[PDB]
């Protein structure tokens, strides 16, 4: 029970899903063929994997994931990868041709001919789960599929499943590093849909991961593999509360009401620490206070956004390991005593904490170090106005003389869709500054 359905949309979604499922298999001792060989100390008939893996009468476990992509190379590589027997033959939907970095292409032309099949797969996933907590959606709005097809899928899931929780660990465009040029267009168009049909969206850009891995993880040349492994570690830390016992057990929908002050306010910073290499893991006495301070440090943030340029409306810390509630209180108190990080005047509490007793793992193939305790922040702050103002200024620069607009309007999208989504983001940034304003 307490299942969470993973929906990996686009190339970035597929990569982060591969990393997440490798991490989950290592968590639950599930071999690449999809079974536990022999576990004596781990008691039999103990099913903590139900939230991510569904059992079969043959003793084999199938992940509760839908790998939806419009182009076949990534899905085919996943098919030919190590998890051949693990990943389901279906629930692994691959299209014919890519969305061409075009939101309209992914949302109106090729997205339409695949969303019905994706929803059939989602229904076949959900009817199995009798206690589905919600949908964990992994996508990057910069590309075509992750923007358009993700928007369409979320739009139809909203009406199909009512008020089911939706946690979208979304990769928005980074301030200055880009892998595309129509990326601001795709982000602006997808943010409109995500505002209405995304319960909580989580920052997952690339520059912050690169900088964090270069500084703390102490490797000169990190790449998408390291970024996806860190994303998977964050996701596992967030979702482990419903997987293992702890002092403060929290579900996916529990922090939905604690982290969202207003319906339009659902984009959240994510932090994780101690994200350190084994070179300095023994050097540093990674206590609860130390890891909490490193998490609260803007340097350790997983998006290139500045908490000090905004105000923390709310925070939700996820302690993972041997973290004592007394140590949690000490860390929270010493955080409140600080001045550089400040809460809004209307949210004196501003804090949520959830403690799980299972220590975080270390994944071979990754640069992380084994630690008896870690902590992941998911925090709503007014600082997101900075990144949205940056991306919408890029959008205004692009749409000023209508560059790359014929490509979008050819697929079938309205020409006024750009403008109307732009007033959407204008109202979004407006309510950001006015909710950051004092009374």
């Amino acid at each position: 029970m307490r299942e969470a359905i993973c929906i990996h949309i686009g190339q970035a979604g597929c990569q982060v899903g591969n990393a997440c499922w490798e991490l989950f298999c290592l968590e639950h001792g599930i071999q690449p063929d999809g079974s536990m060989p022999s576990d004596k100390c781990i008691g039999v008939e103990d099913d903590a994997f139900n939230t991510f893996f569904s059992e079969t009468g043959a003793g084999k476990h199938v992940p509760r994931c839908l790998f939806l992509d419009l182009e076949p190379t990534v899905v085919d590589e996943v098919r030919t990868g190590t998890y051949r027997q693990l990943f389901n033959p279906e629930q692994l939907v691959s299209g014919k041709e890519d969305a061409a970095n075009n939101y309209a292409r992914g949302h109106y032309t090729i997205g339409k001919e695949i969303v019905d099949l994706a929803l059939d797969r989602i229904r076949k996933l959900a009817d199995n789960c009798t206690g589905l907590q919600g949908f964990m959606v992994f996508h990057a709005v910069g590309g075509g599929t992750g923007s358009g097809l993700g928007a369409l899928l979320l739009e139809r899931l909203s009406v199909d499943y009512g008020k089911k929780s939706k946690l979208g660990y979304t990769v928005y465009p980074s301030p200055q590093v880009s892998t595309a040029v129509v990326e601001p267009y795709n982000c602006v168009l997808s943010t409109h849909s995500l505002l209405e049909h995304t319960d909580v969206a989580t920052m997952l850009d690339n520059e912050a991961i690169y900088d964090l891995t270069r500084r703390s993880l102490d490797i000169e040349r990190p790449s998408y593999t390291n970024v996806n492994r860190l994303i998977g570690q964050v996701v596992s830390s967030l979702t482990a509360s419903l997987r293992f016992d702890g002092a403060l057990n929290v579900d996916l929908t529990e922090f939905q009401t604690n982290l969202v002050p207003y319906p339009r306010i659902h984009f959240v910073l994510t932090s994780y620490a101690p994200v350190v290499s084994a070179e300095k893991a023994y050097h540093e006495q990674l206590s609860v206070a130390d890891i909490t301070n490193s998490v609260f440090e803007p340097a350790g943030m997983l998006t290139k956004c500045d908490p000090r340029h905004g105000k923390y409306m709310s925070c939700c810390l996820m302690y993972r390991g041997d973290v004592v509630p007394k140590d949690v209180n000490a860390a929270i108190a010493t955080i409140k005593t600080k001045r550089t990080i400040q809460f809004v005047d209307w949210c004196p509490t501003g804090f949520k904490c959830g403690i799980n007793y299972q220590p975080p793992t270390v994944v071979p193939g990754g640069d992380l170090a084994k630690v008896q305790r870690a902590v992941c922040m998911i925090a709503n702050s007014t600082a997101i106005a900075e990144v949205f103002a940056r991306i919408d200024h890029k959008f205004d620069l692009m749409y000023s003389k209508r560059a790359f607009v014929h490509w979008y309007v050819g697929e079938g999208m309205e020409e006024g869709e750009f403008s109307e989504a732009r007033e959407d983001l204008a109202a979004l940034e407006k309510d950001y500054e006015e909710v950051g304003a004092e009374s």
Partner: protein, 429 residues
């Protein structure tokens, strides 16, 4: 996800033959059609360029065209001639005579019917194709005339699918004929609103690539064609091989075409190292990006000092990290942003593929949409005005059913294209 290719004219046929040799080497296909590659990645997407027969032979998806059967005989007698399908060799009895009118209205028309028959047969035989590729020279008669007629008919028939053409624009310093202005103008004003995207080739730049980057002794046309082949392979590599950052022809089109008429691209390759200086330079992402943005490394002969990049696209192949392949694009976008335009920010598209060309651990193909590409159009237009002002060599074109109005419209379209490129050449801040 596949591309079906066509070669037009002698230049186009030779370039396509070299390209097919390169592709067969990459996919492990020997001239007899069998497969001897040592990787599953070569077979997983070999259907992009090759179709399997009953006996397992991989026939290239290629259509060959020239009014002169001499080049047909040469290409079929070449080392990889047996690879191509015998029925795809489509040729006439009398050559185009270096005449766009003859290759587009009189002799091209009588053969374009069978040409479209062959292309339609191949397109419907294969499952769901990304688009069409063509290789030709604009200074010729049948490469320009029949090439443009083919492009027009394929836009009539399959507008759904992408169109990419490699046009070898002549240069006065390489000019081996006199009707380069007429042929080039009559071809470019077609390709402006017919070809979905048209990257440019200049033998003038191809020659001094072999000097400032290769320092080789005897450069020939076959030597030149390998550069075009390598850039084609780098362009379409991601469709055939996996990568961290995947891309395809539509993705490049979307990221490099801000306005429909601005689809002429300036193209380059890297690394281009000499035999003597092979071990001296240490190849890395920094050197690859520097060679991409080096002016002399371009294989089209227009100076990029005088123009500004509308957009850029780097298609990397090999084993490299992602943050230092994006950080070097950031590095150039910062260091020499005067090459770039402010109204379109972050002008660089990037793609990563895990499989590099044979003989490289890292490689990259660079496709740039710059406002400097109109330099060749301006020079060809100046030559065109010089020739057309005195009605020189116009009786040949008017005796093949064409009128002066076609030349007038071609000049008007060329001037419009030059002006719309020159719109953003000013270094505004």
């Amino acid at each position: 996800r596949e591309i079906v290719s066509c070669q037009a004219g002698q230049c186009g046929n030779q370039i396509g033959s070299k390209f097919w040799e390169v592709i067969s080497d990459e996919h492990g296909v020997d001239p007899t059609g069998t497969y001897q590659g040592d990787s599953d990645l070569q077979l997983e997407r070999i259907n992009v360029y090759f179709d399997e027969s009953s006996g397992g032979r991989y026939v290239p998806r290629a259509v060959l065209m020239d009014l002169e059967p001499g080049t047909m005989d040469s290409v079929r007698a070449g080392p990889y001639g047996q690879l191509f399908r015998p029925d795809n060799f489509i040729f006439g009895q009398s050559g185009a005579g270096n005449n766009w009118a003859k290759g587009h209205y009189t002799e091209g028309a009588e053969l374009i019917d069978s040409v479209l028959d062959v292309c339609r047969k191949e397109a419907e035989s294969c499952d769901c194709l990304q688009g069409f590729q063509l290789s030709h020279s604009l200074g010729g008669g049948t490469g320009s005339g029949m090439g443009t007629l083919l492009i027009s008919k394929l836009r009539e028939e399959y507008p759904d699918r992408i169109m990419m053409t490699f046009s070898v624009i002549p240069s006065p310093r390489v000019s081996d004929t006199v009707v380069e202005p007429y042929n080039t103008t009559l071809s470019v004003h077609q390709l402006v609103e017919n070809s979905d995207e048209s990257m440019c080739i200049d033998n003038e730049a191809l020659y001094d690539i072999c000097f400032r980057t290769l320092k080789l002794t005897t450069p020939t046309f076959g030597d030149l064609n390998h550069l075009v082949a390598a850039v084609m392979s780098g362009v379409t590599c991601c469709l055939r091989f996996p990568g961290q950052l995947n891309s395809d022809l539509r993705k490049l089109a979307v990221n490099l075409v801000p306005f429909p008429r601005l689809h002429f691209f300036m193209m380059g390759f890297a690394p281009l190292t000499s035999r003597g200086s092979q071990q001296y330079r240490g190849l890395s992402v920094a050197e690859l990006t520097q060679q991409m943005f080096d002016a002399k490394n371009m294989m089209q002969a227009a100076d990029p000092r005088h123009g500004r990049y509308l957009t850029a696209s780097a298609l990397f192949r090999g084993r490299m990290s992602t943050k230092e392949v994006d950080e070097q694009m950031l590095n150039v976008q910062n260091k020499n942003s005067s090459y770039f335009i402010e109204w379109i920010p972050n002008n660089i598209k990037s793609s990563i593929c895990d499989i590099p060309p044979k003989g490289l651990k890292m490689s990259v193909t660079f496709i740039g949409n710059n406002t400097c590409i109109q330099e060749m159009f301006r020079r060809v237009g100046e030559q065109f005005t010089g020739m057309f002002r005195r009605k020189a060599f116009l009786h040949w074109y008017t005796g093949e059913g064409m009128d002066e109005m076609e030349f007038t419209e071609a000049e008007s379209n060329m001037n419009d294209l030059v002006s719309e490129y020159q719109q953003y050449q000013d270094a505004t801040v």
